[PDB]
Amino acid sequence: TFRMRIYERDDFRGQMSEITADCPSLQDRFHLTEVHSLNVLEGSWVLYEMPSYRGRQYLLRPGEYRRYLDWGAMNAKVGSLRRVMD
Amino acid sequence: TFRMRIYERDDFRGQMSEITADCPSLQDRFHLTEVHSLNVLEGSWVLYEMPSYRGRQYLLRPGEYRRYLDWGAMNAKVGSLRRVMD
Numbered sequence: 001t002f003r004m005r006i007y008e009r010d011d012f013r014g015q016m017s018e019i020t021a022d023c024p025s026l027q028d029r030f031h032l033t034e035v036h037s038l039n040v041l042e043g044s045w046v047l048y049e050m051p052s053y054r055g056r057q058y059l060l061r062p063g064e065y066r067r068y069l070d071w072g073a074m075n076a077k078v079g080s081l082r083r084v085m086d
Numbered sequence: 087t088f089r090m091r092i093y094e095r096d097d098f099r100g101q102m103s104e105i106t107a108d109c110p111s112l113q114d115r116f117h118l119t120e121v122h123s124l125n126v127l128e129g130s131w132v133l134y135e136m137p138s139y140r141g142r143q144y145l146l147r148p149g150e151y152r153r154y155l156d157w158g159a160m161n162a163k164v165g166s167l168r169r170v171m172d
Contacts, residue, residue: 059170
């Protein structure tokens with residue numbers, strides 16, 4: 001019950017990648033260096049600007065985010081994703 | 087099952103305030119503009135730089151943060167606190 005989908009393009013367009021675990025490095029695993037849209041289907045996650053959980057943080061609660069501005073980021077870059085459990 | 091203690095001073099010194107609910111403004115609730123140390127007993131919370139959950143965000147999971155540097159901030163400014171639920 002931690003499931004989200006990230007897209008190559010804005011508004012849920014482009015290839016999709018479903019993430020169900022923490023990811024210390026989006027570039028190494030998914031070869032993504034920018035997430036343009038995302039849909040948080042289950043659970044809250046924290047999106048990090050840099051790899052290994054570093055840099056500006058942005059909380060992600062269940063819902064749709066069709067553009068990086070929606071999660072309050074200044075750019076579409078993201079280095080790691082983490083699930084909020086404890 | 088959410089709970090934390092907030093101190094205006096470093097290393098858990100001095101006056102302590104306990105919270106179990108969200109708080110849009112720490113200035114209003116406790117006449118606080120800066121928090122210098124905290125102990126997150128239960129739950130995961132997001133601490134915001136400014137009131138009404140706005141500004142830089144910093145995730146706090148159960149644990150002891152004896153000084154602001156410990157939750158990644160570059161200053162002790164904190165405006166609101168929210169429990170990570172949904």
